[PDB]
Structures are given as C-alpha cells and as structure tokens.
Amino acid sequence: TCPFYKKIPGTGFTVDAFQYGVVEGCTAYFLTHFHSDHYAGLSKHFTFPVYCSEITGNLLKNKLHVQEQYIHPLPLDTECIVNGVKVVLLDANHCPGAVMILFYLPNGTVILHTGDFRADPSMERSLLADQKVHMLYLDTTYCSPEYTFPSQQEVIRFAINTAFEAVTLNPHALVVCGTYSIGKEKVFLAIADVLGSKVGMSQEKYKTLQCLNIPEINSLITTDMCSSLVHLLPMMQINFKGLQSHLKKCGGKYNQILAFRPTGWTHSNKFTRIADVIPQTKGNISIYGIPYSEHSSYLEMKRFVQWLKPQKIIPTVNVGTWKSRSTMEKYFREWKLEAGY
Numbered sequence: 001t002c003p004f005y006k007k008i009p010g011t012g013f014t015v016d017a018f019q020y021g022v023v024e025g026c027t028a029y030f031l032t033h034f035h036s037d038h039y040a041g042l043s044k045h046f047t048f049p050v051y052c053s054e055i056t057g058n059l060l061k062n063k064l065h066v067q068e069q070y071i072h073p074l075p076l077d078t079e080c081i082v083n084g085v086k087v088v089l090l091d092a093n094h095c096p097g098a099v100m101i102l103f104y105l106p107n108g109t110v111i112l113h114t115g116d117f118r119a120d121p122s123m124e125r126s127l128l129a130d131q132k133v134h135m136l137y138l139d140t141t142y143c144s145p146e147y148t149f150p151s152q153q154e155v156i157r158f159a160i161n162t163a164f165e166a167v168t169l170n171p172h173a174l175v176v177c178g179t180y181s182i183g184k185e186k187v188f189l190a191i192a193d194v195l196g197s198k199v200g201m202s203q204e205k206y207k208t209l210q211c212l213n214i215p216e217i218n219s220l221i222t223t224d225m226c227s228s229l230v231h232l233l234p235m236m237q238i239n240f241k242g243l244q245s246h247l248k249k250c251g252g253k254y255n256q257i258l259a260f261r262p263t264g265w266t267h268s269n270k271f272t273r274i275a276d277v278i279p280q281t282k283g284n285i286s287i288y289g290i291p292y293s294e295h296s297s298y299l300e301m302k303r304f305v306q307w308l309k310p311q312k313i314i315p316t317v318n319v320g321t322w323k324s325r326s327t328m329e330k331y332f333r334e335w336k337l338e339a340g341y
C-alpha cells in the first residue's frame with residue numbers, strides 16, 4: 001500500500017506514487033522526474049491526471065506512451081492552481097526536467113517536496129526565500145557525514161583533460177561513456193565538445209535525448225557511430241568483456257578505448273582526491289570511475305536545511321530500516337540545535 005511519505009495531507013495529491021494501483025482519494029498524481037524508481041507503474045494504460053514539468057511530459061508521451069490527455073505539464077517558477085490548490089514547480093538540480101514542488105495548503109500550511117535534488121546555494125534566492133515552510137519531504141540519499149564528493153565543475157574538468165590528453169597522444173583511441181537513465185549528460189557532451197566530435201549512440205538513446213530541450217542538440221548528437229569518436233553504451237557494457245566486444249565492431253578503426261563510468265558515491269571518496277584517481281587497465285582498454293553526483297552531499301544538504309528552518313522533516317530515501325531512520329533523526333536534531341530553530 002502507498003506509504004505515508006508519498007501522501008500530501010489536506011489535498012487529494014500524491015507524489016511519485018504510480019505502482020500501488022488506484023490510490024484511494026487521489027485526484028492528481030505528481031511526478032518529480034523521469035527515473036524508473038519514481039515513475040514505476042506508469043504505462044500507456046494510465047487514465048488519471050499526471051502533473052509534471054514540460055521535459056518529464058515529453059518523456060511520458062514518447063518513451064512510455066502515456067496519452068496526451070492525461071499529461072499536464074507546468075512551467076517552472078510560476079504560481080499555478082491545480083484542483084483549487086496553489087502550487088509552484090522549482091528546478092531540483094538533479095536530471096533534466098526534475099523538479100521540487102511547493103504546495104500552499106488551504107489551511108495556511110506550506111510544504112516543500114524536494115523530489116530528488118542536489119542542494120545549491122542558488123536555491124536560497126528562488127521563490128523559497130519569500131515565505132516560511134512548515135514541512136519538508138527531503139531527499140536523504142547521502143544523509144551521513146562520510147558522503148563527500150567534489151563539485152560537478154571539478155569532475156568535468158578532470159574528464160575533459162583526461163580525454164583530450166589521451167586522444168591527442170593517440171588519434172586512434174575511442175572514448176566510451178556509460179549511461180542507464182537520463183542525467184549526467186554533461187559528462188559526454190563536455191568530452192565530445194573538446195574533441196570536436198558529435199556523440200554517437202543507439203536509436204533508443206537518441207530518442208530519449210531528443211525529449212530533453214537541450215539547445216542546439218542536433219549539432220551535438222548522432223546515430224551514425226562511424227562519424228563519431230565519443231560513443232555511448234549501456235552501463236552494463238562498461239567492463240573489459242563488453243568493451244573488447246564493442247571495439248571489434250568498429251572494424252579496425254581504433255586500437256584503444258578509454259571509458260568513463262559515472263558512479264554516485266563510492267568508498268574511494270573517503271581517501272583519494274579527484275586529481276589522484278586512477279583507471280582499471282587490461283591491455284588497450286582503460287575504465288575510469290568518476291564521482292559525478294546529482295544528489296546533495298551531506299554538507300550541501302545540511303546547509304540547505306539549516307537555511308530553510310523547517311518545522312518538520314520527513315525523509316524520502318533510506319527509510320526502510322530502523323537504524324537508518326534513527327541515524328537521520330539524530331542529524332536533524334543536531335542541525336536544529338546548532339542553528340537554533
């Protein structure tokens with residue numbers, strides 16, 4: 001049955017709750033972003049209103065085949081009335097089309113649901129600054145102090161320099177980047193740009209990228225692999241076996257692969273700097289794991305919450321164990337005592 005943390009009290013609304021059948025008393029189903037754990041359950045046979053961003057709407061229509069009549073896109077940063085309740089969608093700094101939702105309840109309560117997000121100081125000068133938030137439904141993916149990682153700008157710097165150096169030394173090297181969902185497009189677009197290449201991929205992945213309103217996208221991607229020296233592959237193919245196999249297919253055009261695995265956090269984060277990352281090598285193939293995160297670090301999360309000063313926090317991630325829940329509640333209390341709300 002639908003868990004409490006996907007229900008919005010005082011409304012007929014739910015958030016990211018599509019895998020429980022018809023939810024009793026739900027008049028509108030919100031979807032924060034197009035990631036499979038969140039959309040799980042939607043299909044072409046859904047007949048209830050779905051509220052979401054323009055980008056998320058493009059993906060529901062084209063990839064899941066949800067019918068146009070049930071898709072309700074809303075612009076960002078705009079006060080909108082939905083079934084007689086005022087709502088605003090805010091950029092979540094997660095994957096393309098990902099949003100946070102502000103709900104202004106008829107009784108005067110204000111609720112923020114972050115969806116998935118990577119907190120940024122820029123959110124402190126959005127429409128959030130303008131009034132008080134009583135309840136916060138929080139993306140707690142990395143709510144523990146061990147979780148550090150560098151900025152997205154730092155990680156992209158490392159990738160661009162790694163690739164540019166390798167291909168300038170060997171013009172017959174191929175670059176491959178793994179993907180399994182939307183998000184992290186900057187990794188492969190930034191590498192292709194420095195190499196003066198389009199990025200080549202499958203027809204299914206090109207279709208997905210054509211939904212994302214990225215400017216000048218036609219100039220940046222292609223289905224013709226042979227014209228391109230940056231290829232995308234399924235993340236499951238990023239290993240020595242899959243890559244050797246892939247190199248055979250290029251028909252003696254390249255003699256080296258350099259590959260990037262964008263991971264979330266990994267325990268090598270607790271010791272090693274981004275400057276000092278090293279690849280896994282077998283022969284003419286090298287695989288780099290790079291810590292490109294689209295979720296808040298512990299410090300970024302703590303700063304956001306201490307700025308917002310919510311009256312109540314409801315976690316939406318790591319809620320399945322008692323030890324996880326207890327751990328999070330302890331951090332929330334420290335933060336509140338340190339900052340004085």
Ligand code: NI
Binds near residue numbers: 033094116
């Ligand atoms: Ni996500």
